[PDB]
Design an enzyme around this catalytic site. Structure first.
Site: not given
Ligand SMILES: CCOC(=O)c1cnc2[nH]ncc2c1N1CCO[C@@H](CN)C1
Length: 247
Positions: A11, A107
């Site tokens: 992501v 989950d």
């Molecule tokens: C500030 C950190 O917020 C995130 O990173 C994050 C924010 N918005 C999201 N929408 N869908 C996933 C996601 C998201 N992450 C995606 C990758 O894995 C997690 C972070 N280690 C969570």
């Protein structure tokens, strides 16, 4: 046009060149069902789905700047009870919605519970989700999935099981984590000493000892081995701690 600022976890964070709007972009190369399910969803406590583009598949999802609930849980401590209750309220709201449209997440855990700028909880990641009700007809599940410390005991013991009690159980594990900063067991099996102790009502041990009697009374109703006897969400909403004014 969108710029890819950083990798969130794959992501990536994308920002609109014109509006400066931020979104999360999921890159994959089962994804078909995730998009299908995401297209059904619309709720304030569920990560928003903006759309998708095919090239390597691209899912555009709500960016939650608050990060993971997991990071709001202090190890061995948890968080302030009022914060936990508020998060638990929002979790129930999201789960009620999903079950209402016949979807089970399968989950639920703090890593899949994200927070926006206002600390509003958002249920995240429907890659393991599935339909459990269609045309008003319930469908029993039989595939094992989720995450061991969060899975209900019936999933490990029975060939078939109802979807909803499984999600309720995982929500109870999340609540425990929020209030004690630790997970009660590696898995809910008879071979697991920590689970055996719980079944024997040894709440004088951790993590149960760190938990106040009111929320603990709720956990006694959620973490029930028999899924048919386990408390339902409508009944959780009548629970005394659930309705206790806090802070
Ligand atoms: C500030 C950190 O917020 C995130 O990173 C994050 C924010 N918005 C999201 N929408 N869908 C996933 C996601 C998201 N992450 C995606 C990758 O894995 C997690 C972070 N280690 C969570």
């Amino acid at each position: 046009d969108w710029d890819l600022v950083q990798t969130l976890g794959e992501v990536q964070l994308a920002v609109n060149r014109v509006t400066e709007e931020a979104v999360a972009v999921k890159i994959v190369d089962n994804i078909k069902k995730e998009i299908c399910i995401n297209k059904m969803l619309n709720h304030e406590n569920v990560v928003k789905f903006y759309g998708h583009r095919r090239e390597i598949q691209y899912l555009f999802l709500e960016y939650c700047s608050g990060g993971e609930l997991f990071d709001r849980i202090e190890p061995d401590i948890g968080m302030p009870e009022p914060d936990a209750q508020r998060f638990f309220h929002q979790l129930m709201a999201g789960v009620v919605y999903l079950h209402g449209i016949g979807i089970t997440h399968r989950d639920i855990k703090p890593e899949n519970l994200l927070l926006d700028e206002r600390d509003n909880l958002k249920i995240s990641d429907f890659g393991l989700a599935t339909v459990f009700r269609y045309n008003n007809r319930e469908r029993l599940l039989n595939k094992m999935c989720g995450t061991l410390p969060y899975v209900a005991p019936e999933l490990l013991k029975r060939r078939e099981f109802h979807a909803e009690p499984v999600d309720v159980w995982s929500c109870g594990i999340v609540l425990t984590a929020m209030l004690a900063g630790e997970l009660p067991w590696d898995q809910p099996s008879d071979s697991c000493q920590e689970y055996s102790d719980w079944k024997e009502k040894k709440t004088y041990l951790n993590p149960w000892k760190k938990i106040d009697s009111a929320p603990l009374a709720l956990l006694h109703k959620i973490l029930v081995e028999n899924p048919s006897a386990r408390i339902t969400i409508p009944d959780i909403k009548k629970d005394r701690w659930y309705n206790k004014p806090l802070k």
